[PDB]
């Protein structure tokens, strides 16, 4: 057996956070369910880049409040993400906003240290989403439902 939903989620989230932090796209192709993962990653680029641009002042404010000191300093962010969902509401708008702020934190990490790693961050986001909303994600057909919910044109 295996946890393919976790694997696929971490790959999409890690890829987006890495390319956002480094400014360079990763060329090696994706693994299992590459079609969905590619479209999902493209959807995240289109939507998530817009969320960051359109809320950049609020995002900077949030960064200031969290005062993230290094690549391992993600416990408060984890608590925030759990808190976001603690009213019992789950939807793709909330999820893409958390991933978008993740990419914003990733760029921040690079400003304070060029050698900063993004894996601790991507894992903390992936953990909240996949572990605490596993069955919701499955019911929505995972990243296919993500692609379909935003239905970006000319992917």
């Amino acid at each position: 057996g295996s946890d393919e939903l976790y694997r696929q989620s971490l790959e999409i989230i890690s890829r987006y956070l890495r390319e956002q932090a480094t400014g360079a796209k990763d060329t090696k192709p994706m693994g299992r369910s590459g079609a969905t993962s590619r479209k999902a990653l493209e959807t995240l680029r289109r939507v998530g880049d817009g969320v960051q641009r359109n809320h950049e002042t609020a995002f900077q404010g949030m960064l200031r409040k969290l005062d993230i000191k290094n690549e391992d300093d993600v416990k408060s962010l984890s608590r925030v993400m759990i808190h976001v969902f603690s009213d019992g509401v789950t939807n793709w708008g909330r999820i893409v906003t958390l991933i978008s702020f993740g990419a914003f934190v990733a760029k921040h990490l690079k400003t304070i240290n060029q050698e900063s790693c993004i894996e601790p961050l991507a894992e903390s986001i992936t953990d909240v989403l996949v572990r605490t909303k596993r069955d919701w994600l499955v019911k929505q057909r995972g990243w296919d439902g993500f692609v379909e919910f935003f239905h970006v044109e000319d992917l």
Binding site: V51, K65, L66, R79, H83, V84, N91, W92, T97
Partner: peptide, 23 residues
């Protein structure tokens, strides 16, 4: 932590805004 709740409330508000727009 009071700051963590303010951040969560802000992310939730943005997230609902995006969800209402595509709903």
């Amino acid at each position: 932590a009071p700051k963590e709740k303010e951040v969560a409330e802000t992310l939730r508000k943005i997230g609902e805004e995006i969800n209402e727009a595509l709903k």
